[PDB]
């Protein structure tokens, strides 16, 4: 009610704007076939949107591992200027719906940068726990260590 911020999906009329928004927004850079493969997600991938402005997006994709059905984040994210708004809390609220409704993951999980200290508090605040520390999943930054953040279901 009221609010400032909207989601939009994610077309071959847009893609360059998640593009360029993950390019600002990530140290890591995605492939073709990573963006490819957005535009056949559907409601797993995002953009967001502050007063008509794209400022965010969320990237999303079934992961069948651990003999499971687990919801994987990719990317989730908002420009600097427009965090702390509640961006981030809609496009995680988004994919937490997703889930409730199909009602057969067993859990959503992502890899966050262990420097990453704003992220990890943005998460544990909606349920998820740090469950692993893989050490070098990163191959060209510092540090190059990533915490393995899951929400059971
Ligand atoms: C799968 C992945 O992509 S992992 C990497 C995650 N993304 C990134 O780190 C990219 C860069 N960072 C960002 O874009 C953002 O800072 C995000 C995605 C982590 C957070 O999204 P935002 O739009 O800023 O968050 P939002 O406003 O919805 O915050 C919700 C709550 O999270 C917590 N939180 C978020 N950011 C912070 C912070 N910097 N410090 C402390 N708590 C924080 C707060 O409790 C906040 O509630 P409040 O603002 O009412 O106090
Ligand atoms: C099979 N699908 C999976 O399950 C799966 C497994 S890895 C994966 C994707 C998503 C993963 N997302 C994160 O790491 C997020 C977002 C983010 O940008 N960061 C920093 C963060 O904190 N967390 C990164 N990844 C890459 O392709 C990727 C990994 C490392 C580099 C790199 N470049 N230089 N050194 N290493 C570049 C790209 N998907």
Redesign the pocket.
Same mark, same amino acid.
């Not at 007063?51 to 984040?73: E, F, M, P, W």
């Not at 809390?89 to 009602?103: F, P, Q, R, S």
């Not at 999980?109 to 605040?125: G, M, P």
């Given at each position: 009610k009221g609010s400032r911020i909207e989601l939009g999906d994610v077309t071959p009329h847009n893609i360059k704007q998640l593009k360029r928004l993950?390019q600002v &927004?990530?140290?890591?850079?995605?492939?073709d076939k990573?963006y490819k493969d957005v535009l056949e997600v559907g409601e797993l991938a995002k953009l967001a949107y502050f007063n008509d402005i794209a400022v965010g997006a969320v990237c999303c994709?079934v992961?069948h591992?651990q003999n499971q059905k687990r919801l994987? &984040?990719?990317?989730?994210?908002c420009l600097a200027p427009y965090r702390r708004l509640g961006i981030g809390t809609k496009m995680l609220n988004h994919v937490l719906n997703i889930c409730e409704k199909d009602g057969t993951f067993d859990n959503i999980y992502?890899?966050?940068?262990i420097s990453?200290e704003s992220?990890i508090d943005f998460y544990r605040k909606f349920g998820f726990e740090i469950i692993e520390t893989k050490k070098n999943?990163?191959?060209?930054?510092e540090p190059?260590d990533?915490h393995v953040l899951q929400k059971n279901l």
């Amino acid at each position: 009610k009221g609010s400032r911020i909207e989601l939009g999906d994610v077309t071959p009329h847009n893609i360059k704007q998640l593009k360029r928004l993950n390019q600002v &927004i990530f140290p890591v850079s995605y492939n073709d076939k990573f963006y490819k493969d957005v535009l056949e997600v559907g409601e797993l991938a995002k953009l967001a949107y502050f007063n008509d402005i794209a400022v965010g997006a969320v990237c999303c994709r079934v992961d069948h591992s651990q003999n499971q059905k687990r919801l994987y &984040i990719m990317t989730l994210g908002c420009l600097a200027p427009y965090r702390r708004l509640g961006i981030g809390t809609k496009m995680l609220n988004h994919v937490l719906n997703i889930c409730e409704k199909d009602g057969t993951f067993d859990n959503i999980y992502l890899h966050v940068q262990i420097s990453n200290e704003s992220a990890i508090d943005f998460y544990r605040k909606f349920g998820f726990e740090i469950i692993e520390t893989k050490k070098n999943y990163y191959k060209r930054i510092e540090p190059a260590d990533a915490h393995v953040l899951q929400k059971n279901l």
